[PDB]
Amino acid sequence: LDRRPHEVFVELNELMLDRSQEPHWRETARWIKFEEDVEEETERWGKPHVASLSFRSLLELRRTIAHGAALLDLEQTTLPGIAHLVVETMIVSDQIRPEDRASVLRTLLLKHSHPNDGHRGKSLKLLEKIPEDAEATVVLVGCVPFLEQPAAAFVRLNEAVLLESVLEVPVPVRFLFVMLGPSHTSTDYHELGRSIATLMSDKLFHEAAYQADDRQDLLSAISEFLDGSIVIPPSEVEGRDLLRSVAAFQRELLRKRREREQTKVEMTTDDPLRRTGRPFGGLIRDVRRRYPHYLSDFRDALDPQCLAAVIFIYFAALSPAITFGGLLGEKTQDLIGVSELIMSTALQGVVFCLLGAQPLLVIGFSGPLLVFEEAFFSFCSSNHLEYLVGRVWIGFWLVFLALLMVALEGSFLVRFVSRFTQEIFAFLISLIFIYETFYKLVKIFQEHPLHGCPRGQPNTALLSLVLMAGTFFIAFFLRKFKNSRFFPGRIRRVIGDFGVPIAILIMVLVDYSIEDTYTQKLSVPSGFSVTAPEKRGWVINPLGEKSPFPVWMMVASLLPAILVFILIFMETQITTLIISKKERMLQKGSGFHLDLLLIVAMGGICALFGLPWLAAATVRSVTHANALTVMSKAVAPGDKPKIQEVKEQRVTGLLVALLVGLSIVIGDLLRQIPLAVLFGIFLYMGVTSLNGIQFYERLHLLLMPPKHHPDVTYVKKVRTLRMHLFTALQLLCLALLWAVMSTAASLAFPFILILTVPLRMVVLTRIFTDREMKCLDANEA
Amino acid sequence: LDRRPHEVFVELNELMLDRSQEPHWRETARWIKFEEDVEEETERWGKPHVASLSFRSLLELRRTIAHGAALLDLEQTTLPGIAHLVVETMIVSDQIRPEDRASVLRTLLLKHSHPNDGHRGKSLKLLEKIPEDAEATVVLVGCVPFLEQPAAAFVRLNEAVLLESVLEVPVPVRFLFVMLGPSHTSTDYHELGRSIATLMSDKLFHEAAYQADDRQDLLSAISEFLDGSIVIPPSEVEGRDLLRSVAAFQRELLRKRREREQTKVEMTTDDPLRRTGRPFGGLIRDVRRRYPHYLSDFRDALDPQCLAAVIFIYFAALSPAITFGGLLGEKTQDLIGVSELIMSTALQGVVFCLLGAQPLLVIGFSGPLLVFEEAFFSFCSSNHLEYLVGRVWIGFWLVFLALLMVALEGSFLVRFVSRFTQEIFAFLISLIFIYETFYKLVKIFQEHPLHGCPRGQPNTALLSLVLMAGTFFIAFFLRKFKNSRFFPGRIRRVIGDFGVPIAILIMVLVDYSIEDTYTQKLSVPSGFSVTAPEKRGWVINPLGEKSPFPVWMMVASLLPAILVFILIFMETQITTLIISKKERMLQKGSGFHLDLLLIVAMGGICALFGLPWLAAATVRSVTHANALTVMSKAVAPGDKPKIQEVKEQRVTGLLVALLVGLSIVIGDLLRQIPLAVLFGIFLYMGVTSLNGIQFYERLHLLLMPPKHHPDVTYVKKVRTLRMHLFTALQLLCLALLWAVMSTAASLAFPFILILTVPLRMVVLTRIFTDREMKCLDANEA
Ligand SMILES: CCCCC/C=C/C/C=C\C/C=C\C/C=C/CCCC(=O)O[C@H](COC(=O)CCCCCCCCCCCCCCCCC)COP(=O)(O)O[C@@H]1[C@H](O)[C@H](O)[C@@H](OP(=O)(O)O)[C@H](OP(=O)(O)O)[C@H]1O
Ligand SMILES: CCCCC/C=C\C/C=C\C/C=C/C/C=C/CCCC(=O)O[C@H](COC(=O)CCCCCCCCCCCCCCCCC)COP(=O)(O)O[C@@H]1[C@H](O)[C@H](O)[C@@H](OP(=O)(O)O)[C@H](OP(=O)(O)O)[C@H]1O
Ligand SMILES: CC(C)CCC[C@@H](C)[C@H]1CC[C@H]2[C@@H]3CC=C4C[C@@H](OC(=O)CCC(=O)O)CC[C@]4(C)[C@H]3CC[C@]12C
Ligand SMILES: CC(C)CCC[C@@H](C)[C@H]1CC[C@H]2[C@@H]3CC=C4C[C@@H](OC(=O)CCC(=O)O)CC[C@]4(C)[C@H]3CC[C@]12C
Ligand SMILES: CC(C)CCC[C@@H](C)[C@H]1CC[C@H]2[C@@H]3CC=C4C[C@@H](O)CC[C@]4(C)[C@H]3CC[C@]12C
Ligand SMILES: CC(C)CCC[C@@H](C)[C@H]1CC[C@H]2[C@@H]3CC=C4C[C@@H](O)CC[C@]4(C)[C@H]3CC[C@]12C
C-alpha cells in the first residue's frame, strides 16, 4: 500500500508488584537512537549508551516470534478493543487456555507508571528531543503466575492513535508487542524486551516492519539486521585501548554492507573563485549576491544573542589596540601611537561594516605588520629619509596594485597557499607575542636594577613581573573553566567568555590598592589630538615636511608596496577562506573580491593621514563568528551537537567599531591601567593561539616514543622517520625565516614566505611520495 | 587420554605475491590474550585491541568447518610429511581433484615471512611476554587461481614439535589450520582467518579442542563460545559515552554464565589483630614471625634498585625536618629548633630500623604534632609553668600508657577507626601545610612594608613571594611530568622522582646569583650543639630548671599524655594498616604491637633530653614502599601492570637515618638556603596530598550538575541529595574541629577527633540506610 515510514520512539514497560502488592506496569528504558535505562535503587535516568545485546536472548526472541501470533493492520482504536482482539487471537492460536481468558485480560487493562508520574516541566524537555513526525511503539513484557507457557503477540495498528496514560510523552502509538509467560522458565524476560526494542529502534528493521506483511518478512529482516553486527568474544576488558578499534571496524563493515546494497540498487535500476574573463567580474558577482539582502542584514539583529557579543568583542578589539600602538610609540619615536591606531581602527571598521561583503570580519593591527613597520623605520633613518612621508607613496602604490589585482581576476591564488605555509605564518604570529613580552620584561629589569639603598626605583621590576604573571594565570584559568564540567552550564559559558575583562579588572584593582610605588602606565592623550603635537600634523605633505623629498624614492618605493601587499593579502584571504567553510552554516554569501579591494584601498587612503594599515585578524574573526551561532534543540540524547544557524548582520560590528572609536573620551580612566597587565594579556594570547595547528603537534611528537603516538590519520599511514623529516624541514624553513627577519635585511621576510610557496610543490614533491603528501599536507580534517 | 592443556600463541599467515611475483606467506596478526595487527602501508605493529568479529564470517566459518576434513593426533614430525598427509586426506574427502595434487602441494612448502625477518633483539623482547609453557598454532589462509572450491583441514599434532622458519618466535606448534579456495567467491579469507584465530585463542575453546575427538565437539564448542558473546547493533558510534557500558554488561553476562557452569559442576560433584588472652601475646606473635628473617633482611639489599631510593628518600626525610624545626623555634622561643629535630629523627630512625618489625616505615615530625606543641606552650606560659620540664612528665606517663595498652591486647581498636575519621584526619594534615605558608607570607609582607625611599628592606617582600611561587611551580610540573607520555619511559620516572631536589636547587642558585638583596636564611648552628646554648642544657632536670616544679602538675599531667597518645596511635596504626594490604605484595610479616610500643617508648624516653616525639608518616612510608617494588615482565601486551615483588630490607632505612643525622656537619652549606624556598615545598606537599581521599571528590561534586557526575560506586547507588547531606555532615564536623583548634582550648582537638568515632556508629546509622553506608563509608575500593 503506502505505509510511509516514520521515526520511532520505543519504550519498555515491565509488569511488577507494588508495595500494596497491586500489579502494574512500570517503565524501564527508552530508545531515541540510543538506550536510556532507569536505575532501580535511585529511580533516575542513566547516561545514554550503545544498546549491547546478548546472543542467547536473540535466539530466544527468534524462537518466540516464530511460534507467536501476529495481528497486521488492526482496525481497533481503543485499548480495550485491542486487548480483546489480542486475547481472542491468542485463544485462536492455541497459546492460552480459554479458561484463563478472563484472567490474562485483566493483566492488559492495568494502570501504567513512569518515573516522573512538575510533569510538564520534563515532558516538554523530552518532547523537544523527539523528532516532530515520530510514531511510538510500546513493548509489554512480564511474567504471570497463572500461565504455563509463553505467549506472544505483535500488533500493527492501521492508523496512528493516541493512547492516553500508556507512554511517557503524548506521541501516537503504531506498534504493540505483548509477551506473557510463566515464571519458572530459564528465560529472562527483561532481556527479551531489550532485544525486541533494540530491533524495533533500528532504521532498516523498522522500515521493513512498516512494509512487512507476514512472519517470514520479519525473519528476513532479523537476518538482515544480524548480517551487519559485531560480535565481541568473552574476554575481560582490562585496559582502555581495547575498545578504541570498534568504531573503525564498524565503519568498514557498514561500508561494505552499504556498497552491496548500492550495487543491488544499481542492478535493479557556484564557485566563488572562478575567473570568467570579463574585467571586474568577481566584484559584480560578489555585489549582486550580497547587496540585495541589505534590509535583512539590519532586521536580523533584534535579540539578546546579538547584544551579549558586543559586550565582550569590544574587549577583544580594544586590548591589542592599546597594546600594539604603545609599542609603535616606543619604536617610531612616538610618531604613531595609541590614539592614531584607535582612530584608524574605528574609521576603517565602520566603513567596512557598512560597505563590506562579509560583515562578520573584524579588522585591526596584527603581529607581522609592526615588524615591517619597524624594519621600514630602520631603513628610513639610515639614508637621511623622512619616515612618515614615504608611507604616503607606499599607500599610493598599494592602491594601484589592489586595482590591478582585482581588475584581472587574480584572487584565486589563495588556493595555492596550502597548509604548509599557513602553519608557518601561524607560528610567526604566535612568536611576535612571546618575544615582545619577554623583551619588555628584560628592559624593565635593566632600567630599574635590583640594588639596595625616573630610574632606579626600588620595587618596580618585581611588581611588574608579579602583575604580568597574575594576569596571565587568571586569563588562562578562566579559559580552562569555560570548557570544564562545573556550574549550570550556561553561566559557565558566560563566565568563561569574560576572561580578559575579569583578569584586567582584578589585576588593575590590585595595583590601585598599592600606594607609594611607581609602575609605568598608559599614555593616552586628552581629547582628539595627535600623540605628538609638536612635530607632526594631521595631514602629511606628499612633497616633504622638513626637506624636499627625493624624486628617486618616489618611483623606487615599489618594493615595500609589494611586500606589504603580500602580507595584507595573505592575512585577509586566509581568514576569508577559514570563515566561509561548509561546517559553519553561513548562508547568504562571502566576498573574496569586495574585501581585498576595500581593505587595501582604505589602507592606502588612510596612510595619507599618518595612520597605519590594517588587515583582518583570523582569530577574533572566528570568535565573532562563534559568538553569533545558535545551536539546535531537536538533538537526540547522547548525540553530537549540531549548529542550527548563524545570525548574519552588520549591526554588531558597526557598534563595536563605534565603541572602540568613542573609547578615547575616557582617557582619564584608561590612564590608570599599568603597562604590565596588557603584556600579560599579550603573552596569554600568544601562548593560547598555538593550539590547533598541526605543526605544533608534530613538533610535540618528536619527544614521544613511537609507542605513545596518537591514532590520527597523519601518524598511522606514514613511517615515523618520514614524519620527523617533514617536521625537520618545516623547522629549518622557520629558523631561516627568523634569522633573515632578525638581521639588517628585516624587510624581506614576505619574499621568504612567497619563496616557501613553491618550495613545497617542487622540492617536497620531488622527495616525498604522492601518497604521503596527501596524509601530511591535507587541507581538510 | 591425558592431553594436558597449555596456553596458546596464535599466528595468522596469509598467502600473497612478492614484487618478483614469487608467492609466499606473510604474517598479518598475532594473538597473546589480545589481537595485534600489522599495518600494510608502514609495516609496523599496531596497538593491542579487543578482537571484534563479524557475524557473516562466523557463519561462513561454521559452514566451512562442517564440510572440511579433520586430522586428529597425527604422527608426523616434519613439515613435508604433514603437507603430504594433508593433501592425501584432502584427496580422500573429495575436496581437491587428484590432478591438482601436485600444484597445491607446492603451495604448502613456500618460504614464510615476518615483519622483522636485529632479529634476536626483538625475538627476546617478544619471548618475554609469552608464557613459558605455551604451545602455538598456525593459521594458513589464502586464495589460489588453480582451485574451484574451497578446501579446509584441521590438524592436531600428537606431540609438540618445533617447526623452524614458520612462526615468529621459537615456540613448538600443536595445531594447524589450512584453508585454500578460489578467488571468485564472495567470501573474505582474511575475515575467516581472524575468526578461527580468535576462536582458538579463547580460554575454553582451546581446552575443548585439546579434549575434542571429532567435528561434533568442535561445533558444540563453537556454540558454547557464542553463548557468552555480545552483539553490537549496526548504529554509528557518534559520542564517546556510548561504549563505556560494555564492560559492566560483559561482567554480568559472564557472571551468569559462570554461575550456570558452577551449578552444573556442583550437581556433577592468621589474623594479626586477634587477641588471645595471654599477657603480651601480640608482642611474642609478631616477634616470632619477623625476627628469624634477620639474615635475609640484611642480605636482600645488594642491587642498584636498593641504591637509587636512598638518594631521594634522603631528600624527602630532610626537607620537612629543616622546615618544621624552624617553626618550633619561632613558636617556642628557640627552645626546640632544627638541630634538635634532626638529631631526634636520626636517633629514633636508626633504632627503629634496627629493632622494628616493619623496617619500611620512616618516622618523623608530622603536621598535627606542632599544633599540640604550640597549644601546650601557650598553656604553660599562662600559669607560670616551665615549658620544657612538663614534657618530661608527659613522656613518663606516655611510656606507661604504652605498656598498659600493649600488655592487654588493645591494638585492635584501629578496626573501628573507619574512613569517616580517616578523611577528616587527612584534611587536618593537609590544611596545616597551606595555612602556615600563607601566614608566613603575610608576616613577611608586614615586617618589610612596600613603601618607597632588620626591618623595612626594599625588595624582600616581593622576592620571597617570587621564590615561593617558582619553587612550587617547578615541583608541581615535574610531578606532572613523571606520569606523562614523553621520553624513553625509564628516564621519565627517574627525572620525575627527583622533583624536590631539582626544584630546591634551581631556586637556590637563582637566589645565589642575586646580589645586594636580603632574604632570610636558615639558622643551623655550627657543630653538635643545642639551638640556644644560653638558657638550655642537654639534660633536663626532672625537678625544675629555674624554679621548683609544682607537685600537683606531676600527677595532673595525665590528660596531655592521653591527648598526645591518641595522635601518635592514630598516625602510626593508620600507616601500618595502609602499608600491609594485599595489593602490595609484602611478604614476611607486619607488626602491629612491636611498632606502637617501640615508637611510644622511644618518644617518652627521648623527651627527657628535650627532644620532640615522633610518629610514622603515612605519605613518606608509601613512597618508600613504592620505590622498592619490582614489577614483572611476563605480561601479555595490552594487559594491566602487575607487581612482581617488593624488596623488604632494613638497610636503606638505616642508611637514610644515618645520612639525615650526618647532615649537620654541612651546616655551612645548609645556611645558604633562603627560608622562602622551603615554604614552596611546604605548600606543594600540602596541596599534592589532597588527591585520593573521597571527601575531596565528594566536595567537588557539590558544584557539578547531576548530569556530569562520574560513574563511581558511591554516586550511582545513592540519591544526590542523600550524598550532599553526607558531605555537609562531614564538613560541619571539620569546621567545628577547626574552630575548637583556634580558640583558647586548642589542646583538646584529639578529644574531638576521637568523639567522631561513636558518632558514625550511633547517629549516622540512625539516619542513613544500612545500604547507603556500605556505598559511602566503604573501607575497600
Ligand atoms: C560578585 C561576586 C558574587 C560572588 C558571591 C557568591 C557567589 C556564588 C559562589 C560560590 C558558590 C557557587 C555555585 C555553586 C552551585 C550551584 C549550582 C551547581 C549544581 C547544579 O548544577 O544545579 C543546577 C541548578 O539547580 C539549582 O537550583 C542550584 C541552586 C543553587 C543555590 C543558590 C546559589 C546562588 C549563589 C549562592 C551565594 C549567593 C551570593 C549572593 C550575595 C552577593 C554577595 C556580594 C541543576 O541544573 P540542571 O540539571 O537542571 O540543568 C542541566 C545542566 O545545566 C547541565 O549542565 C546541562 O548540560 P550542558 O549544557 O552540556 O552542561 C543540561 O542541558 P541538556 O540536558 O539540555 O544538555 C541541563 O539540563
Ligand atoms: C630546546 C627546547 C627546550 C624545551 C624542549 C623540551 C625539553 C628539552 C629538550 C631536548 C632534550 C632531549 C632529547 C631527549 C629525547 C629523544 C626523544 C625520545 C624518543 C624515544 O622514545 O626514542 C626511544 C629511543 O630512541 C633512540 O634511540 C634515540 C637516540 C637519539 C636521542 C638523542 C641522543 C642524545 C639525547 C640528548 C641530546 C643532547 C643535547 C645536549 C648536549 C649538548 C651539550 C653541548 C625509543 O624507545 P623504545 O620504543 O625502543 O622503548 C619503549 C619506550 O621506552 C616506551 O616508553 C616503553 O613504554 P612505557 O615504559 O610504558 O613508557 C616501552 O616499554 P614496553 O614495551 O615494555 O611497554 C619501550 O619498549
Ligand atoms: C634540526 C634537528 C636537530 C631537529 C629534528 C631532527 C630529526 C627529527 C631528523 C634530522 C635528520 C633526520 C634523518 C635524516 C635523513 C633520513 C633519511 C630518510 O630517508 C630514508 O628513507 C633513508 C633511505 C632512502 O634514502 O631512501 C629516513 C629518515 C632519516 C634517517 C631522518 C630521520 C629524522 C632525523 C634524524
Ligand atoms: C556552605 C557550604 C560549603 C556547605 C554545604 C551546604 C549544602 C551542601 C547542604 C546544606 C544543607 C543541605 C540540605 C539539608 C537538608 C536536606 C534534606 C534532605 O531530606 C531528605 O533527606 C529527604 C528524605 C525526607 O524528606 O525525609 C535532602 C538533602 C537536603 C536538601 C540537603 C542538601 C544539601 C544542603 C543544601
Ligand atoms: C629538541 C628538539 C626540538 C630537537 C632535538 C631532536 C632530537 C634530539 C630528537 C627529537 C626527535 C627524536 C627522534 C624521535 C623518535 C625516534 C624513533 C626511534 O625509533 C629512533 C630514534 C628517533 C629517530 C629519535 C632520534 C632523536 C630525535 C631526532
Ligand atoms: C561554595 C560551595 C561549596 C557552596 C555551594 C553550596 C550550595 C549552594 C550547593 C552545594 C550542592 C548544591 C546542590 C547540587 C545538586 C543539586 C541537584 C538539583 O537537582 C537540585 C539542586 C541541588 C540540590 C544543588 C543545590 C545547591 C547546592 C546545595
Author numbering:
A (entry chain A), B (entry chain B): 314 to 430, 497 to 648, 672 to 855, 894 to 1221
Passage from the reporting paper:
Anion exchanger 3 (AE3) is pivotal in regulating intracellular pH across excitable tissues, yet its structural intricacies and functional dynamics remain underexplored compared to other anion exchangers. This study unveils the structural insights into human AE3, including the cryo-electron microscopy structures for AE3 transmembrane domains (TMD) and a chimera combining AE3 N-terminal domain (NTD) with AE2 TMD (hAE3NTD2TMD). Our analyzes reveal a substrate binding site, an NTD-TMD interlock mechanism, and a preference for an outward-facing conformation. Unlike AE2, which has more robust acid-loading capabilities, AE3’s structure, including a less stable inward-facing conformation due to missing key NTD-TMD interactions, contributes to its moderated pH-modulating activity and increased sensitivity to the inhibitor DIDS.
To overcome this obstacle and gain structural insight into the AE3 NTD, we constructed a chimeric anion exchanger, combining the NTD of hAE3 (297–671) with the TMD of hAE2 (672–1241). This chimera, termed hAE3NTD2TMD, was designed to exhibit the inward-facing conformation with a visible NTD, capitalizing on the thermostability of human AE2’s inward-facing state. Functional assays in HEK293 cells confirmed the pH-mediating activities of the hAE3NTD2TMD chimera, and both 2D and 3D-classifications displayed EM signals indicative of a full-length anion exchanger. The cryo-EM structure of hAE3NTD2TMD was determined at an overall resolution of 3.35 Å, with both AE3 NTD and AE2 TMD clearly resolved in the EM map. In the hAE3NTD2TMD structure, similar to the full-length human AE2 structure, a homodimer formation is observed where the TMDs adopt an inward-facing conformation. The AE3 NTD comprises seven β-strands (a-g) arranged in a planar configuration, sandwiched by eight helices (NH1-8). Dimerization of the AE3 NTDs is primarily facilitated by interactions among the loops linking NH7/8 (loopNH7/8) and NH1/β strand c (loopNH1/c), as well as helix NH8 from both protomers. In the hAE3NTD2TMD structure, the AE3 NTD engages with the AE2 TMD in a manner reminiscent of AE2’s own NTD-TMD interactions, with the loopTMH10/11 extending from the TMD into the NTD surface. Specifically, substituting Q618AE2 with E617AE3 disrupts the original contact between Q618AE2 and D1079AE2 in AE2. This results in a new electrostatic interaction between E617AE3 and K1080AE2 in the hAE3NTD2TMD chimera. In our structure of the NTDAE3-TMDAE2 chimera, densities of PIP2, cholesterol, and CHS in the TMD of AE2 correspond with the previous AE1 and AE2 models, further confirming the lipid regulation of human AE2.
